[PDB]
């Protein structure tokens, strides 16, 4: 995916302020709360009965950190997302059989979490740059389907 230099600047500048220990778990937790069918893939994580249970679940926070790490890796290789996400694509498509629509949903939940954390700093043009990013990640993660 192609970001302008202005968009790259906006994206990288904001990402440097991201709390990498928390934002991923917040995005994964909100996915599980907002789109409850995604809990199907996380039976082994234990207590997901309430939103508080989900958000405070240590396994959700730990797995969220790995997800964010993958987004971070994508931001470093915007011109080669397919190669970057090849193994993850094999995992999520061939092994897990997650419908790729959910990759789009998690990307959009991440965008909501960034908006929540950064407030007015998450301007409409900053969002538009991040939408290019999370679309790119979703399409690359979906590569084994197409």
């Amino acid at each position: 995916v192609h970001l302008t230099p202005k968009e790259k600047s906006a994206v990288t500048a904001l990402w440097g302020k991201v709390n990498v220990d928390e934002v991923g778990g917040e995005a994964l937790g909100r996915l599980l709360v907002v789109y409850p069918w995604t809990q199907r893939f996380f039976e082994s994580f234990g207590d997901l009965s309430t939103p508080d249970a989900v958000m405070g679940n240590p396994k959700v926070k730990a797995h969220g950190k790995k997800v964010l790490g993958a987004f971070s890796d994508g931001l470093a290789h915007l011109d080669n997302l397919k190669g970057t996400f090849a193994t993850l694509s094999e995992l999520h498509c061939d092994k897990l059989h997650v419908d790729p629509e959910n990759f789009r949903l998690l990307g959009n939940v991440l965008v909501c979490v960034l908006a929540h954390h950064f407030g007015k700093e998450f301007t409409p043009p900053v969002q538009a740059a991040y939408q290019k990013v999370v679309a790119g990640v979703a399409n690359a993660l979906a590569h084994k389907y197409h």
Binding site: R30, V33, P51, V54, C112, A115, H116, F118, A128, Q131
Partner: protein, 141 residues
Amino acid sequence: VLSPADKTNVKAAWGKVGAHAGEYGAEALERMFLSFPTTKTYFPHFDLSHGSAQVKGHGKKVADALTNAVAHVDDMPNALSALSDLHAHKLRVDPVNFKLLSHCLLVTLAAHLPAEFTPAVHASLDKFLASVSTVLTSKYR
């Protein structure tokens, strides 16, 4: 379907929007136009640049419709019937685009109302906007 808690959450969160209602509607539209440029073609008679009086006025209309839906949340198909006819028949709005604007409304609320945008309220707002979208796409002919 919206639960009692969903209706409570949506009413509470939308209650915090206040005199910013029109402003937030306008910002959600701008977010949509910039993030998802396909949506721009519905507004050729609009200047879609930042500070556009037309986008500002349209944001107020979108907010007034959402406020109507909140105020009549148990009777939304009826309350939004005219708007459903408009979007599906006259304007022929692609149903995908309601998901795009709904997402941009969530982003706008998150950016403005950090205390209100809890995971539970995020879920309720998503269900509410999906319900509004379901009504507005219900009349394709």
